[PDB]
Amino acid sequence: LAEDPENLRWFVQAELVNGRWAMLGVAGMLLPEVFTSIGIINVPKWYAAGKEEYFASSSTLFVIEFILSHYVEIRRWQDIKNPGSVNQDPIFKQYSLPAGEVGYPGGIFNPLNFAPTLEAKEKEIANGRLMLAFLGFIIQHNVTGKGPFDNLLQHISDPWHNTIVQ
């Protein structure tokens, strides 16, 4: 019987988690970029480490890291239903305990607050979308080629290309 604007703790959290991981992902590229250096999916096996052991399959490195990742991840689902994180930085974020205004249900637009400091992460929000939908682009453009820019005496024009196969 209750009309609108339900959502709550809800999935404001989901997006922001997308923004924060999108930003990190982009950093995972980032890397070559000035010394053109290394490229693309790479499928790397990541940084290395330096060799005595491997040849390297060496087991499933991910499967393991990821079992651990997995009870950090629960910790967060927990918090979100009923909350405890000492910093308390997504759920509201810091400046913490309030967000009371969300906690008892029903806000409808609300902007929000955070940190003992100030400048309300509305500036992290942006730096954060761009990185959302930046993967979007980045992932899209593979299918074809690695690299962007720098110079024209020839490069900018996009004089001849592949298409999609049909």
Partner 1 sequence: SAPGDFGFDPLGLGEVPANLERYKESELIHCRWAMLAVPGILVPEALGYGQEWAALPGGQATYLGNPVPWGTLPTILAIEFLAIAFVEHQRSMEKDPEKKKYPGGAFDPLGYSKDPKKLEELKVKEIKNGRLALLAFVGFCVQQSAYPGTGPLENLATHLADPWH
Interface residues with ligand CLA (CB under 6 A) are 13-14, 17-18, 21, 69-70, 73-74, 77-79, 81-82, 84
Which residue matches tokens 């959290």?
13
| Using rule CB under 8 A, residue 3 touches partner 1 | no
Residue 79: which of partner 1, ligand CLA, none does it interact with, CB under 5 to 8 A by kind? ligand CLA
Amino acid letter for position 48: A
Rounded Cα gap, residues 39 and 33, in angstroms: 9
The response to whether 82 counts as a known ligand-binding position is: no
Q: Which of the listed partners (partner 1, ligand CLA, none) does 13 bind, with a CB threshold of 5 to 8 Å by partner kind?
A: ligand CLA
Type of residue numbered 71: Y
Residue 17: which of ligand CLA, partner 1, none does it interact with, CB under 5 to 8 A by kind? ligand CLA
Distances (CA, A) of 64 to 16, 18, 61, 68, 165: 26, 23, 6, 7, 39
The answer to whether 26 and 134 are in contact (CB under 8 A) is yes
Residue nearer to ligand CLA on the CB measure, 79 or 89? 79
